[PDB]
Design a protein around this ligand. Sequence first.
Ligand SMILES: [Mg+2]
Ligand SMILES: [Zn+2]
Ligand SMILES: [Zn+2]
Ligand SMILES: [Zn+2]
Ligand SMILES: [Zn+2]
Lengths: 88, 209, 155, 107
Amino acid sequence: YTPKAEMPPEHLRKIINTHSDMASKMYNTDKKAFLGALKYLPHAILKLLENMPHPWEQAKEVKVLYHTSGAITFVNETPRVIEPVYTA
Amino acid sequence: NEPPPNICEQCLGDEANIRMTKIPQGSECKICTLPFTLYHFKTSKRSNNIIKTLICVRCATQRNICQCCMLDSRWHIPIQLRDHLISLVVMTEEAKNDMMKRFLSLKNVKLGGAQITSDPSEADNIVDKLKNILLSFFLYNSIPEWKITDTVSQLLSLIVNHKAKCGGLRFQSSELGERFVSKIFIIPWSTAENIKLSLSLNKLIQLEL
Amino acid sequence: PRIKTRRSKPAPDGFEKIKPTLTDFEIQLRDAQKDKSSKLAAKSNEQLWEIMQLHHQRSRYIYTLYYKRKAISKDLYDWLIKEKYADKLLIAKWRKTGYEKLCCLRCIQKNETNNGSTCICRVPRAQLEEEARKKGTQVSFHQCVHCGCRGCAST
Amino acid sequence: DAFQLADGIHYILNHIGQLTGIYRYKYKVMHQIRACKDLKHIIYYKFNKNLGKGPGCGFWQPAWRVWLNFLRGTIPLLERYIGNLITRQFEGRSNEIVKTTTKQRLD
RNA sequence: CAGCUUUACAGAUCAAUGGCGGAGGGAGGUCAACAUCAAGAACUGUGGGCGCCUAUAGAACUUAUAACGAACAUGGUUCUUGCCUUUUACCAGAACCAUCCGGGUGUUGUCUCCAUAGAAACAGGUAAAGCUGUAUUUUUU
RNA sequence: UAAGUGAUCUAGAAAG
Ligand SMILES: [Mg+2]
Ligand SMILES: [Zn+2]
Ligand SMILES: [Zn+2]
Ligand SMILES: [Zn+2]
Ligand SMILES: [Zn+2]
């Protein structure tokens, strides 16, 4: 159906920052979420690694999904290239 | 396979459409501490606070109660009270133990009384039987302070010991007291003999410990 | 915004005029993006809401200057869009009918919500208020949990 | 520097083996490590033909690719493993059944 | 420089017949949902003849140093090996199997960005595009 | 009158 809302990165950043000193009864469930996320952390790693900016690239912008709890963040895009161009 | 949720009329709401979500093995039942499907409904769309089911269907069946209200399915009375009434015309003993409670839950006997409530025959009969059965100032001379306070208010800090039976009301205003006197169980300022004696005895009792 | 890496040309013509307006925003964002030890769920949510609002606001400003006021070149607008400054989808939504006052896109993702519908914010205050009146109770909701949006509707 | 960064990356990818113990815990990463080493050998010989021996060879690509492919395999294994562990932590097994196909306990 | 077929054109009688007609989008998203992609070189229906012949047709994708990948991981099971002597974690081969990281194609649905006409051919011209042409024995002198 | 080209296993961690 209707596509995902392109959120601002700022929001994501804020979320991340909140779950640094996480030790209240607030986000009990966020800790649970985090724990769960281990399941997909290797996937996330694979994604991020795959998106590694190549040496002809100062800094790559990349698509990102992230759990609103702040538990996990997947680089979403899969980096495809024009093969000959890539080789060059 | 799953049985259906047993939610009462007053529990659920006053409307001809309610939407609820089922959460299979959501929480453990409070009685039995055994996984079961949580139903939770919002009553009216916008009216705040959800109504989650707190007990497993089996347990509800056993007690014959609303899965939210924890009250008799029929008469909408706390389990104790409903059972007590039946007894008056035997009550349930929920076994408060880690292992045993679960076992009890799984048993399907309708614990105690529940059977009577379930059947039109039996509940009705019980009801009938019940019907038949039915058919500043110190203060001296047991009843609660919330009643005393109410009385005082009507007449218009309020200390009362019961072992003493000696209620020292302190309005802290000469207006309130002088209104209180005119608008009107011994009531002085800051079988009479018998009463005095009793009071004295009470005082003594209070003072020996 | 993203970081400049000599990918796109520094900026088109009229950026110097608007830059100081949307650079105030950056400061605000920076204040937002950090550990406000909220110690409380509602409080925590509030910062997120604030952030969202800020994000919206910049876009609105940009949108307003390009469409309504029309005081900025098309090229510049395009450049802005390409950069992270504006939100493109949001802008598009705004441009469409019935979505002009629009807190955020994820308040109209019908898939997301538990009940298959839009956010309440999208209900015009009028209707909710009327319902409340009919019922007996007062105005029922204040702001949604996605973004702080007291009466987002186009009315 | 950019060149330096590239070189660093290359080093990491070749030296996964030394840099950090994966191989300890799963010793089929050893194959991957070997492959990386081979690539380095090949790549370095191609790259330092007229040019002499030293550090500063970039060209991390094939190594990177290899690591990515290794990760693919892990994704599954980790999802069973890590996921299982987390499940246990939340809901920790009832009545396991031992298995006599083991050399021990058979007799 | 002739001929016929189509557009761009007036003003037509507008029958006659055709063709564009229940005449209304296009470009795209690191956007979805579904279908389907290893089988007798292998496809799908349609009737008819009676699970199979004969005409209709359609057919997007993938394949011959055989495959959705000019790409390559990991599992599980047996069997054999090797380091070994306990197992995991491993060696390397085999056979079945799975998982995974991906890929198309088709159909919808959406999201975005640009846009808005409900009627024209005939008699033949005006102009431009498609093809053919350049009487003395076998075609028409 | 003719020697002397190439084939190169491995590869560690836990618990016991
Ligand atoms: Mg031992
Ligand atoms: Zn109830
Ligand atoms: Zn809103
Ligand atoms: Zn919103
Ligand atoms: Zn909203």
